[PDB]
């Protein structure tokens, strides 16, 4: 949901 | 006609020990509360007290394993908290998280009970951590227990099991936990509007597509409105309410409206990327107040720009008090609405 990684 | 409000600064204790600037900030609720006081809404509301949910109340929606696991974090050392948190998707845990999740759920129980017994007409709950990503058996997406889903079950337990509960989830993210808890249920109608991007936006599941209409006798009672390719705002949300949300809800005829009121679809949100204005949130609230004879409980979910959430939620409260709404289309938003209409026309004659 938060981080920018794609599935967070 | 009385509007209730519940806020407890004890819910600020849940925090991120490794990143104190993580967007699910303790000051989300204190900023929203402060803004209510600045706009003079606080003095116009009846303060409803917070309380802890009981573990028996948590089991209305959650497994005893999940409850026990989160309960066990209250006394863990920092390394055990870090490792437990990493076992979930997008979760941080401190020694206060469990108590904070209990206070969030119990606050909404006391609000729903106040509404259903006629002490107030409607209510707003300024609560942390959020709830709508929590599943029966797992925490997810900053959420530990599914506050809104528990509140629906709590409401039925103090009235009757067939109490019709409409949950509108306008958080920018799909309330996957809520959808799953009520997927085989026609007593609780779940309607979510959310950024979807063909499944690439969090929570990253096709579960959130328009063709997921519910299971069994819940067929038709799960309404997914997913947004793709576009920075949506008030025209798109207005149109989805006119064409889908309000026609279906009126047909369902709910006896209480729970709003999973995330404000991360707001203009300025760092996670949502959308542009709903505070005036738009007022109009969405004003529309929902025509259901259930105004028995609406607005529950804070997400929303991560402190100024945007404080202005937006205050406008929803202003609407609950009876203030008149303030003065207010992307092509891909029409595609979405039309896709949901085709999927749900078979169960809703209003469509
Ligand atoms: K949503
Ligand atoms: K349902
Ligand atoms: Zn969200």
Automatic annotation (TrEMBL), chain B:
Annotated positions binding Zn(2+): 171, 173, 264
Transmembrane segments: none
Subcellular location: Cell projection, Axon; Cell projection, Dendrite; Cytoplasm, Cytoskeleton, Cilium basal body; Cytoplasm, Cytoskeleton, Microtubule organizing center, Centrosome
Family, similarity comment: Belongs to the histone deacetylase family. HD type 2 subfamily.
Protein name: Protein deacetylase HDAC6
Organism: Danio rerio
């Amino acid at each position: 949901x938060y981080x920018x990684s794609x599935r967070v | 006609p009385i509007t209730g409000l519940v806020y407890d600064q004890r819910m600020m204790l849940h925090h991120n020990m490794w990143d104190s600037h993580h967007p699910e900030l303790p000051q989300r609720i204190s900023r929203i509360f402060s803004r209510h006081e600045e706009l003079r809404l606080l003095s116009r509301c009846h303060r409803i007290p917070a309380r802890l949910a009981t573990e028996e109340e948590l089991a209305l929606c959650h497994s005893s394993k999940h409850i026990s696991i989160i309960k066990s974090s209250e006394h863990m050392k920092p390394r055990d908290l870090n490792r437990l948190g990493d076992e979930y998707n997008s979760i941080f845990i401190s020694n206060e998280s469990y108590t904070c999740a209990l206070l969030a759920a119990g606050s909404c129980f006391n609000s729903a009970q106040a509404i259903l017994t006629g002490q107030v007409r409607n209510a707003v709950a300024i609560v942390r951590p959020p709830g709508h990503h929590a599943e029966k058996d797992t925490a997810c997406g900053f959420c530990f227990f599914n506050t809104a889903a528990l509140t629906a079950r709590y409401a039925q337990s103090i009235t009757r099991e067939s109490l019709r509960v409409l949950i509108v989830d306008w958080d920018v993210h799909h309330g996957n936990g809520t959808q799953h808890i009520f997927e085989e249920d026609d007593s609780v109608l779940y309607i979510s509007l959310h950024r979807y991007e063909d499944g690439a936006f969090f929570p990253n599941s096709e579960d959130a597509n328009y063709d997921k209409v519910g299971l069994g006798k819940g067929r038709g009672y799960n309404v997914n409105i997913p947004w793709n390719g576009g920075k949506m705002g008030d025209p798109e949300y207005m149109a989805a309410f006119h064409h889908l949300v309000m026609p279906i809800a009126r047909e369902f005829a709910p006896e209480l409206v729970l709003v999973s009121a995330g404000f991360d679809a707001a203009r300025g949100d760092p996670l949502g990327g959308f542009q709903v204005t505070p005036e738009g949130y007022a109009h969405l609230t004003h529309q929902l107040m025509s259901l259930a004879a105004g028995r609406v409980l607005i529950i804070l979910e997400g929303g991560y720009n402190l100024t945007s959430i404080s202005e937006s939620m205050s406008m929803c409260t202003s609407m609950l008090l009876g203030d008149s709404p303030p003065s207010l289309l992307k092509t891909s938003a029409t595609v979405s609405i039309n896709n949901v209409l085709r999927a749900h026309a078979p169960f809703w004659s209003s469509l």
